[PDB]
Design a protein around this ligand. Structure first.
Ligand SMILES: CC[C@H](C)CN(C[C@@H](O)[C@H](Cc1cc(F)cc(F)c1)NC(=O)O[C@H]1CO[C@H]2OCC[C@H]21)S(=O)(=O)c1ccc([C@H](C)O)cc1
Lengths: 99, 99
């Protein structure tokens, strides 16, 4: 699907058997999700954005179905105000910017 | 132009007679630029991100030439780590996400 940007590009994702809505973010290099419970072992990490830095838990090789498109990659879980789909997963489902 | 997301979607912008590089950010509702001077009267505002919040100066009806595509809209200037082109200006240049 082609997505115009007159509204926030929110899509429905399926991660760990849970349904959530996430923001297709071309300005994000990696995926960051709000607090949730994810299987497996994680490693602590600190990511930076506007306003400073937050502590997140890095989960590797996590499957996500983004708007019916499957992808596996690293997912960061932490106090993000909004669920974000970063470029690490956008490239797997073949997303492009066109103008 | 079609832009893949394997690298940061950076574009050359022309704003206030100055040349800068900015990130086409679909995850940003507003355009946020590092410190500079623009015309007209401004009003203070505070915007939030992953790490918290930063104080910005809201400038309205500001012209920006993004990769040769002109657009006028609100531009926020403040201590952002990276120049961000938000959806307020992406819609003006006809930007879409495609997968
Ligand atoms: C350094 C370049 C960018 C600042 C990186 N960011 C992506 C941006 O798209 C971000 C998305 C966003 C949307 C949102 F609603 C809440 C929120 F907290 C974050 N936009 C943003 O801050 O927008 C501002 C301005 O407009 C306003 O509207 C919405 C909020 C305000 S990031 O999220 O910091 C980030 C993500 C992933 C990684 C991985 C580890 O690589 C690192 C860093």
């Amino acid at each position: 699907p082609q997505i115009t940007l007159w509204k926030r590009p929110l899509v429905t994702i399926k991660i760990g058997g849970q349904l959530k809505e996430a923001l297709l973010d071309t300005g994000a290099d990696d995926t960051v999700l709000e607090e949730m419970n994810l299987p497996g072992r994680w490693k602590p990490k600190m990511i930076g954005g506007i306003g400073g830095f937050i502590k997140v838990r890095q989960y590797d090789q996590i499957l996500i179905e983004i708007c019916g498109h499957k992808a596996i990659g690293t997912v960061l879980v932490g106090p993000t105000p909004v669920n974000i789909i970063g470029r690490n997963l956008l490239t797997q489902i073949g997303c492009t910017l066109n103008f």
